[PDB]
Structure 1
Amino acid sequence: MNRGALIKLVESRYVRTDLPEFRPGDTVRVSYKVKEGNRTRIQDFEGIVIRIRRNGFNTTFTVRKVSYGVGVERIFPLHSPLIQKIDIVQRGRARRAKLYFIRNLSDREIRRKLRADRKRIDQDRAAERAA
């Protein structure tokens, strides 16, 4: 037998292929479904993806924003059914896999360390020009 496949088979029914590709250093907006009172709304959340932990189906990416004077990090199952969508908003060129150090950097200092990623930008604009 093969244990991996079977595992991959059980997951196979809950895998997403509509979410966009992205990297740490990018700025992301994640339209996320939320439940409250008593309905369900879609709460956007925009921050630097500082951590994409990978495992095929068990890939989970960490988005960081600074909300009113407080720094917030939050974890997203990359194949969660709660994510309505994900919009890219900037290609940051982090020169590293995990961005644990921008937790202590100033909004300015963070900008020097993640000046835009021109490449993965025109490359984006390269597409987007469908017919």
Structure 2
Amino acid sequence: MNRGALIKLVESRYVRTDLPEFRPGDTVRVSYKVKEGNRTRIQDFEGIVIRIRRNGFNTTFTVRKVSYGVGVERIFPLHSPLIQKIDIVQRGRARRAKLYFIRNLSDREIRRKLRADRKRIDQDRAAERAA
């Protein structure tokens, strides 16, 4: 047998394939299906992807935003069926893969370090030029 393959096979019915690629440093908006008694609505959540940890189907990504004065971080399973959609808001240029350090930065200092990723912005805009 092949235990790794079987795990993949069990996960394949749940694996998502419709979300945009993104990187630590990118600003992003996750439209997340949320329930509130006894209906369910779509609550957007915008912020910077400070972290993505990869474990195949089990990859998860963390988004950080300030919100009415307080910093809020949220962790989403990248293949969660609760994610309606993900919009890429801004491509960010990070020098590392985990951006925990921006927790202790002023807004103006985060802007200085995570300058707009020109190269992948052009990639975005040069896509969407299609039939």
Please report the TM-score for the alignment, with normalisation by the length of structure 1. Answer: 0.99
Secondary structure at the counterpart of residue 43 of structure 1: strand
Secondary structure at the counterpart of residue 101 of structure 2: coil
Query: For 1:92-125, what per-residue CA distance to the aligned partner results, in whole angstroms no more than 9, with x for missing partners?
Result: 0011000001000011100000010000001110
Cross-structure match for 1:122: 122
- What RMSD over aligned residues (CA atoms) do the two structures have, in Å? 0.5
Secondary structure at the counterpart of residue 71 of structure 1: strand
Cross-structure match for 1:96: 96
Output the CA distance in 1 between the equivalents of 2:108 and 2:15: 38
Please report the TM-score for the alignment, with normalisation by the length of structure 2. Answer: 0.99
Query: For 1:1-60, what per-residue CA distance to the aligned partner results, in whole angstroms no more than 9, with x for missing partners?
Result: 100000000000000000000000000000000000210000000000000000110000
State the percentage of identical aligned residues.
100
More helix as a share of residues = 2
Output the CA distance in 2 between the equivalents of 1:120 and 1:72: 27
Which runs of structure 2 are paired with 1:1-131 in the superposition (5 Å)? 1-131=1-131
Deviating above 3 A after TM superposition, structure 1's stretches of 4 or more consecutive aligned residues are: none
Q: Which runs of 5+ in 1 are unaligned?
A: none
Q: Which runs of 5+ in 2 are unaligned?
A: none
